[PDB]
From a paper:
In [name] and numerous other bacteria, two of the principal enzymes mediating messenger RNA decay and RNA processing—[name], an endoribonuclease, and [name] ([name]), an exoribonuclease—assemble into a multi-enzyme complex known as the RNA degradosome. At the core of the assembly is the endoribonuclease [name], which initiates turnover of most messenger RNA (mRNA) transcripts and processes precursors of ribosomal RNAs, transfer RNAs, and small regulatory RNAs (sRNAs). Notwithstanding, [name] predominantly acts as phosphorolytic 3′ → 5′ exoribonuclease that catalyses the processive degradation of single-stranded RNA, involved both in mRNA decay and sRNA-mediated gene regulation. Beyond the residues that form the catalytic core (1–529), each protomer of [name] presents an intrinsically disordered C-terminal domain (CTD), extending from residues 530–1061, that serves as a scaffold for the RNA degradosome.
Author numbering:
A (entry chain C), B (entry chain B), C (entry chain A): 1 to 549
D (entry chain D): 1004 to 1058
Amino acid sequence: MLNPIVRKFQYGQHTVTLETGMMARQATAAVMVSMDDTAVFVTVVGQKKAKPGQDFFPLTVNYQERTYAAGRIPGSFFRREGRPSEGETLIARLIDRPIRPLFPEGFVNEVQVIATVVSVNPQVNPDIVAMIGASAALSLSGIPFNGPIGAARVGYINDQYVLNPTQDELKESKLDLVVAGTEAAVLMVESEAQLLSEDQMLGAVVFGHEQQQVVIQNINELVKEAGKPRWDWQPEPVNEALNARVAALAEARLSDAYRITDKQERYAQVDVIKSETIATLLAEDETLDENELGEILHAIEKNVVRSRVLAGEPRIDGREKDMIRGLDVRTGVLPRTHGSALFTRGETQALVTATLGTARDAQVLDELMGERTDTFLFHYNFPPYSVGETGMVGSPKRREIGHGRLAKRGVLAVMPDMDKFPYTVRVVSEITESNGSSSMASVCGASLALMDAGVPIKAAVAGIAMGLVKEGDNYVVLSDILGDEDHLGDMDFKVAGSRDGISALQMDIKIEGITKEIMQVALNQAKGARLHILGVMEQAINAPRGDIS
Amino acid sequence: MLNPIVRKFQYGQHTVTLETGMMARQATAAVMVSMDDTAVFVTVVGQKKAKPGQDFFPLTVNYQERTYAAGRIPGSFFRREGRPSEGETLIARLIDRPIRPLFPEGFVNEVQVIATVVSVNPQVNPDIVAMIGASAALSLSGIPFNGPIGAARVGYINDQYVLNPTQDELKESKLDLVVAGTEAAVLMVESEAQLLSEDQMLGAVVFGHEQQQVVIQNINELVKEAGKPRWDWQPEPVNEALNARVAALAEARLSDAYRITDKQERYAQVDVIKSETIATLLAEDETLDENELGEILHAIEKNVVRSRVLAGEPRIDGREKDMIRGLDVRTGVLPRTHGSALFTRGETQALVTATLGTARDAQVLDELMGERTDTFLFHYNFPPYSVGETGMVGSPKRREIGHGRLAKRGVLAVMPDMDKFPYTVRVVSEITESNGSSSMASVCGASLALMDAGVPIKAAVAGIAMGLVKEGDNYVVLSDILGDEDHLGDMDFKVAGSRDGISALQMDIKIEGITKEIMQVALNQAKGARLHILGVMEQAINAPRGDIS
Amino acid sequence: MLNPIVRKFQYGQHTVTLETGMMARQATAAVMVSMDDTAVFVTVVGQKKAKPGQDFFPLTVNYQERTYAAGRIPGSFFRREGRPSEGETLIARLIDRPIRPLFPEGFVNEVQVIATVVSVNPQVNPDIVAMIGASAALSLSGIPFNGPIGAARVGYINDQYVLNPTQDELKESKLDLVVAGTEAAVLMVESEAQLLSEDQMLGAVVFGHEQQQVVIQNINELVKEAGKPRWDWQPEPVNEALNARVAALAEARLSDAYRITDKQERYAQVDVIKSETIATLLAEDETLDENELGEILHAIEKNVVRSRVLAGEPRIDGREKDMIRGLDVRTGVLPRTHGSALFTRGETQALVTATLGTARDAQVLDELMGERTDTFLFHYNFPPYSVGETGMVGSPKRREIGHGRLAKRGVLAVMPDMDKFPYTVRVVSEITESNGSSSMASVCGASLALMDAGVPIKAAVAGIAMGLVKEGDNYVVLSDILGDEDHLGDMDFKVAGSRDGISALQMDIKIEGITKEIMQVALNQAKGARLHILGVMEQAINAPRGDIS
Amino acid sequence: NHATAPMTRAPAPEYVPEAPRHSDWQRPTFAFEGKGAAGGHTATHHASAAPARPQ
């Protein structure tokens, strides 16, 4: 009837079992991963035909936790799990991040990955088991997928790196890093630390990458034993003639339009060149599609910017590689809030407020592992006017939740201990303008607001968003990347921290070849940026005021 | 000014009053129905023009319970009735199931039926009143509707059938059955029972049907007195020439394709036939619609399967009329769950878990008819990957809630009493695969999980979903119908129960001519199927183990 | 660095600060308005290109209250602000009502105004501050907008008018009137009073209009200093030739058709005229769009109706200007409710119920300005069948919330004080038919239900919805306006009250020229109408019918 | 803890008509003293007026 295929291996101090072939045989792949009694059933379904006119890859990742896994009847009024919680959305994004770049270019078929936690050992975290399950299911499915990934969590106990620290071990640890990566490269890093150095935070990434390779190898063996035949998928052919004609008509014009300084005149010249080239081609032949010409023009403009940056020429706004945008800091902007601050970096502006309460205001979360009491609450509001647009107000998308979590990770390391400060603190960050890293501005504003409110924080914290552009052996590390430089980001990293250590690190690498020396250079330039911001910030406020509540 | 038409009659022990013609005069029809002191106001609005190129029939039934009907202010935080609850959704589905098949073929105008409960007698259930007010509204409106339907609830006390038992009689009843039917044939049965025989249940369907006649006759008199003129709607003419051409081109080829035993090659040949017919007809004339050709091909395919089934030929998967699919029972599949099971019938799979809680985890429901504490909770999750498709996740639609309620009805008869087992029990059924009746696999999985958890259930219960196909006087009862045999279901019935008697029965008749001997043969074949499945389940686990939590 | 532009002025007893140029620099305009310590940040983003084929003006106003403005951590389960509450929606509607009519005709670009309460003084309401901020932001944006508006709140204390009274002053006030208007004319009035006369309620409107000119002047000065250049927007040219064509085809025929004294035949003839004209024109030139021709025909019909009303001819229902529709009052309709009433005015019907409860049923609202206990709960239900349509139920729009609040304001003045009646009262009003003002029938039904239940109300209250059509110096006041006569409303006012005074007043002026004397003529005609309705109502129930709790 | 089963036929069992059951219980009559009806014909107070102009 059913013949399940089981693959068991040893992952540090735990045993990982991958079971496939018995459950959900109507999905494109389904696996059940178990790590020391924590079990996560992960399914992937892929459509074999792409809808005509699809321009973006429709990947959905859903993460669900079931209370029956922990042996508890849910405490909701309806006694059923409702919409995904904040943690579930964060874990779904954590699974999403390392697997999007691994689908081939031009793959627009709809893919959905559903990971449901079915058993939970209170000491083994279900998120690494969900990431392993997603990688295994995607590798077994046969959908075009450029390599299995492995995931690992690193901790720092007694000045030693520890693989997959347990919930009891994670209390004494000074680090909590999640590194996901393929056999050849690191893809995703999401880490919170207690003000550690840069070597201490890169060593952990290397350790976790080197310890997750057994997962990759065992998934490879499982796929060899019980994998589906690979999809016969080919990317849509590139219309080389149209690209060549558009290039010969507009490439020199665009390359030379970018040499002028003024932003508005440059935009006008760009639009002019675009209109003339598009019209000329459209008149010559009518079968040409407007959107296809627009995308080919966007692509040529992006290649122009990339070539200029890599060639040493000033950036779009006239800044150099290591230059940080202009900084403005104000405190006490709001009259009747406990603490308030307005932080502006270039065109990224955040209004951050800190509110003090009593212990009854602490948030009680009924998570699978146990009931938790949170006394530091961080909320992140990204309204539509921050980018000059209209839309829905009060709906937090996945990115608006991940950014808030990153900012909270950035500020968590300097928050006062309950004994010294026995009050509940809520920090709310409204992003009034966004043309850069809104989350790093959120971290800076949170530090300023917390000091204005009188919270006895250990030190001031600031963050910087950085990018790296690589071609062959040549690379350029760009500081304070703009909202229009996202394409120019082979490696995108967001480092937060104080003057003496890193408090949060997020890295998303979309290319191969990022060695350890490259990361050393990138995080040293990021240290210099952070220290510049922190020094500018110190002038406005240097110590917490004596205003307790 | 306002002159209402009132019709009063006697329904069993109660007085039913139907009033029309004064309230909601802008709707197509509106009726106030009062049985004793329970009053429901039911309104039907039908659009007079169909939507351009509409294929399916949009029918919406909305059931609302107002707390002021009970003389109570709602206890929600906003002190207002919000989204419909599970009970209201189930009652709306109860109203929807009998009336949907009674609109003429080709009728695609939009119809909304809103039933608001405006007064409640605590001893009189409003659902029967809501189904007699929906029958009355639909019959007075003039919308094409093939007959007034009646509704009756039947109970079984002291070995005697009881018409419309009160809520104090239902505690001593061994049965709770809802029959809805027209003047000629029964259309919907929804029943739970404490392990009653099949003759005891058929006599209940015949009792409820022979009591509904009063209601039907009185609604017919009210329609004669104060009924709107009937709509001049006529079905869209069928393209007889196009159907004849498609038949002459593809019928023999499809009939030959269905003689092939293998599934994949038969599907490939069917797709080849469809594509070649489409290409040929498009070459003959370009104006012919593609979706219309596909629907005509599908109709011919359905008529072919029905002809083969009614003539004694084996089913599409090679089974005979009474053959059950392969079974697979696994108990104890999740490590840290109180009780768990995996039940597989062919390609329908369900993973079911049972969790034990304390008396504080019982669900408190403030229903319009009183406050009820439920100590047995059944939840039913139908994820998209069970059918191999991508879709929204975690949103239970109406059919999923109905299937969960049906499974709970199927298992509620064997659950231990609060003296024997004083704990709360939550059973969660995850449909991992669906190619049949997942709601009946949930019953078996729940029995297995409850015996694995150690719950001292009286006996094991299993269920089977069956169908009946009738042509003239020739009928075939099919056991364990698939998801691709829905068209073949002139009668679709689901019978759940133990080795001794039936614990739940659901029927949805869509034809006329089903006498009592046909229903007895159908439920004796369902008895045999249940016994086979129960014996297979017994071979795995025959009694609850020793556990408590 | 950033350079803010600040303008300070004195508004009554408060100091108002308008600040611009520092925050949200990527929006069309952004203003921080601080009255005393109540600070609201208002933002306007307007799209520069209209959607192709866009018919209506898309204007969205969002009003959000942040709990940290009050220095409190939100008490919700997630400790975070969520979906807009009822009060926030009501204040957003309040802000939307005056600004909407002030965008030039033919303006269809998308505009979103977002107001956020960033700091609150408990004695200063933030809604007037939000209105001032909306006007300032829409005047500094450049978007075609006709004049700044002011906003004032007036109370009546010690027989004197007080401007923007505090909450402490509002507790001893017999009036709460919000008046908004431009420099030339008043535009919106929403008020609640304790049975005040018509002269008393018009003096407040005049007083607040005169007192808000300081706000208008200072906004003009701020726009002079720091206003964005005015948009070069031109209304799309009107097709005068097509308007001529259709006029000559159908105008006289429609005018003659409107002398028909029967509704069914007249509408059938109108449809025939429309079909014949659209046939003719469509055939002459296929290019002509049918939707535009339908719009032109609708405009011609509306102009004919306006010419008839203003010429003194009967209305579209045969009534004159001072005639009220037919009334039908019933009390005691539902058998198990505490109090019930069916109120019918022509073709507008409301079924209203009253429920009594204890102190535990009183709603508790956590507001920024302070916690409040609501012991009178008014709820409003406008189902689709009230207008003979099909739609979604249980999802109240903003219209049904403004209407529920208006009905509650109308009934609130006569409710018994707590010492005499120490219970909680919930009134629920379901609109069963709507061909006019369902909210004023809601007020009459609420009075009847409250007397049937036994609540010792001070007096019976009824409401009337009136209209005023002005052209030059000629005006006609229309009593009991229908829903098909909305276009005829240059002024649309709804007055509620008892035999002795007005309890709620809502005006929506959209033209300039309505002097005080015109308002006295209109409120005297509305008084006569209300007294007629009240006389008819007293003939049924004349005093509270004592009943159980 | 495991049990499988092939694709097998489940023939319907032999039918045995039930013996008609006899009872003496008489259902207690329902005591309901109330209006019962809930429409507008049940109103305790009723007033109406024709389309008219205020006095």
